[PDB]
Paper text:
The human norovirus genome contains three open reading frames (ORFs), where ORF1 encodes non-structural proteins, ORF2 encodes the [name] (VP1), and ORF3 encodes the minor [name] (VP2). The X-ray crystal structure of norovirus native-size VLPs showed that the VP1 can be divided into shell (S) and protruding (P) domains that are connected via a flexible hinge. The S domain forms the scaffold of the capsid, while the surface exposed P domains contain the main determinants of antigenicity and host binding epitopes. We determined the binding sites of six novel human norovirus specific Nanobodies (Nano-4, Nano-14, Nano-26, Nano-27, Nano-32, and Nano-42) using X-ray crystallography.
Nano-42 bound on the bottom of the P domain and closely overlapped with Nano-85 binding site. Five direct hydrogen bonds involved P domain residues (Asp526, Trp528, Asn530, and Thr534) and Nano-42 residues. Two hydrophobic interactions were formed between P domain residues Val529 and Ala536 and Nano-42 residues Tyr100 and Val54, respectively. Interestingly, the Nanobody was also held by three additional hydrogen bonds mediated by an ethylene glycol molecule. Ethylene glycol interacted with P domain residues Arg484 and Asp526 on one side and Nano-42 residues Thr31 and Ser53 on the other side. Moreover, six water mediated bonds provided additional stabilization of the bound Nano-42. Although Nano-42 binding residues were mainly conserved in [name] noroviruses and were identical between [name].4 2006 and 2012 strains, Nano-42 apparently distinguished these two strains in the ELISA cross-reactivity study. In addition, although the binding epitope of Nano-42 was rather similar to that of Nano-85, Nano-42 did not inhibit VLP binding to HBGAs. In case of Nano-42, small and disassembled particles were equally present after treatment. A striking example is Nano-42 and Nano-85, which despite having almost identical binding footprints, showed distinct binding and blocking properties.
Residue numbers in the entry:
A (entry chain D): 1 to 71, 76 to 118
B (entry chain A): 224 to 344, 352 to 538
C (entry chain B): 224 to 344, 351 to 538
D (entry chain C): 1 to 71, 74 to 118
The structure:
């Protein structure tokens, strides 16, 4: 029962930057993970950046620090973008509980074109 | 499902599951590498005992059986051969699916203790200091036989009930082959260990194993040796009885200050019964001993641990 | 209120709460007239630790502290005075409301064990030796923060260094070793009264006997088969302390059950202050399977007559 | 909320016998004690005989085996033998309800007069 609302994205010039926003509502949990994945056609959906309920971050090591995630509601800052970063970006919410197995929730996705 | 729980015992209220010692500190070391595959203190989160693990704190590194005869050996001292039974006194069946009799020591070294005897039927008694070299080719507990040595030259009786009470290590000098992460050869030289509990390691690169550390006494020489266990004996006893279904591969636990109620750090308790943390610091964890681990939720590999 | 429970550990899965030993047998003696007032393995059913009772199985009859000096004594051997701390290393405060530091032995006799030392600061020097503590001695004053031990070893014991006593058994049970598992030590020595003691325990009814968890204790030498009887095993102490369930009457009815057959072997009363009584047409060790366990069945009272074992 | 139905009272000649029966319904328990008390004018109500759910008996140390209690769960019978005028009293059935989750609860019958 988690609903995910995404925003931002769109067209950007090479070397440019933009900032993605995702917000979660419904049956949120005290302990959770929130973040973004991205996918282009024929490639796998890949982790970009995630953050836990106590603020712990994880980044794709291929990004080389060009991206930063922060905070429920989260924001992704994307710097020094390259045409290879062109993709569809998806918000993900993982709901954790002491009394059930982890549950995943996905956003509708937002297109980013560099 | 039956809810997963941990005991509410604090760090000063726990004991080691690999040697009869109190837990002294929590410990990680990012500078230390080893294949971690200890066989005592092994229990899955849904209560399945593994390796040589049994429930009695008095059974850890203990032996019971009978002396068959005095024997000759290269090592200094007087040497005795001893048949070993199960700790409940029943004969050990080598065909059972365990590495050795339950409680058997799970590391290489010279284990120092007391051998005591009470003759079979006001029976006569004797006790003496004794050493068991777990690296010796004569250490074959899976075959129902081990050897121990005494400083005492003659006063050990054959065919009488014999108990080994562990106390510490004889030595950790260069010739004593102490390595807490090297398993004994339970059936001796020309055989492979069987039915082992699996090796444990962090799934993530930025994570380290978190141990419950106890400092172990020494008969002589120099050093400050320690024994690290994956979970304290009270957790093994708790999990065995509860036998709660595991709802994911990893439980999130928080180390909490019971006085203040605040979280000091967090860790992953894996389904196979061991802890990991994200820590760059090394050595003993600086935290109060009146803290305790509290189960907060079932998580998975996507939950990044906070640095401590 | 939270429901009262007991662990589901079997008899072969329990340890003694008065000495580091496995439980060997269940035991009664209708001929014993001692006052039963042990101080380890004392816990109420709603989880209150009493006497010198603490949670660590490694802490039972253990001491921690430092040697002050070699001393002279009537007993044979070499003698050492030792200041004792709490087992967690903090200084012992004699003004706290306990009989002695938690874990202190609660019976008269010569306790046999190993004294081991690790020097303060790496590669510190170490030594360990066999040692005896006579709990009946006037120098046995743990409530005053000081005890005495003796060794066969004549010289190799260091003063002012961290010192650990690991109990193993009894040195002797001869007449001059004064073993009596029901005689308390004088925790403060001569001319003093023991303080903050856990109360003595007894059947309220005639025709009921105390039921003990019995362990046989090792001997360094001499003749005999000495035993230590505890009121509840250490695992019950640990369980009750954590659970802290309200006690709904003065006595809980428990049944000793065979898990294989599921049938009840006998029944017993578990009293609120933490001990068992039974009705029995026999004496000595109880003949029952070691894979049996006690199951809590209901809160009862004095009007519930126990069936004979 | 345990209901007790008593029966078997009334008048009896000296040396005669009667059998009282008490039956329990409502909130009965697996573990219980059932028995009889009696009271004579001017005296406290005193135990006669009781029996537990596994059959263990307790008798007033004065009946000297002249009475027998026995058990059909939640049912007891008191066999009253060789009766005397001194046994004239009001006899009360007593049920003690025991539980793992509540303190013991006592229930008494309305009482049945026995006149010898």
């Amino acid at each position: 029962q988690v609903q995910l609302q995404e925003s931002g994205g769109g067209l950007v010039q090479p070397g440019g930057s933009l900032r993605l926003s995702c917000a979660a509502s419904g049956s949120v949990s005290r302990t959770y993970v929130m973040g973004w994945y991205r996918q282009t056609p024929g490639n796998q959906r890949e982790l970009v950046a995630t953050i836990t309920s106590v603020g712990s971050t994880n980044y794709a090591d291929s990004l080389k620090g060009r991206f930063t995630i922060s905070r429920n509601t989260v924001y992704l800052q994307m710097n020094s973008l390259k045409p290879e970063d062109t993709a569809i970006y998806y918000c993900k919410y993982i709901r954790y509980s002491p009394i059930h197995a982890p549950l995943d929730y996905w956003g509708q996705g937002t297109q980013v074109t560099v | 499902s039956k809810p997963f729980t941990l005991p509410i015992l604090t760090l000063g209220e726990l004991t080691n599951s690999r040697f009869p010692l109190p837990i002294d500190v929590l410990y990680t070391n990012p500078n230390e590498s080893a294949i971690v595959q200890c066989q005592n203190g092994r229990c899955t989160l849904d209560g399945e005992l593994q390796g040589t693990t049994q429930l009695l704190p008095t059974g850890i590194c203990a032996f019971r059986g009978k002396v068959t005869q005095q024997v000759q050996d290269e090592h200094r001292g007087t040497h005795w051969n001893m048949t070993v039974t199960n700790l409940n006194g029943t004969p050990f069946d080598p065909t059972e699916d365990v590495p050795a009799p339950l409680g058997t020591p799970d590391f290489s070294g010279q284990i120092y203790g007391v051998i005591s005897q009470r003759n079979t039927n006001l029976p006569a008694n004797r006790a003496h200091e004794a050493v068991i070299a777990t690296y010796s080719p004569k250490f074959t507990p899976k075959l129902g036989n081990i050897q121990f040595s005494t400083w005492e030259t003659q006063d050990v009786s054959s065919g009488q009930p014999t108990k080994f009470t562990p106390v510490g290590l004889a030595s950790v000098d260069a010739n004593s082959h102490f390595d807490q992460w090297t398993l004994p050869s339970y059936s001796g030289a020309l055989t492979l260990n069987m039915n082992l509990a699996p090796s444990v390691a962090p799934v993530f690169p930025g994570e380290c194993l978190l141990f419950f550390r106890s400092f172990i006494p020494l008969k002589g020489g120099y050093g400050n040796p320690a024994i690290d266990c994956l979970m304290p004996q009270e957790w093994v006893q708790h999990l065995y009885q509860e036998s709660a279904p595991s709802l994911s591969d990893v439980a999130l636990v928080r180390y909490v200050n019971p006085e203040t109620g605040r979280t000091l750090f967090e860790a992953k308790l894996h389904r196979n019964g061991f802890l990991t943390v994200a820590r760059n610091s090394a050595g003993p964890v600086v935290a109060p001993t009146n803290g305790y681990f509290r189960f907060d939720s079932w998580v998975n590999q996507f939950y990044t641990l906070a640095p401590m």
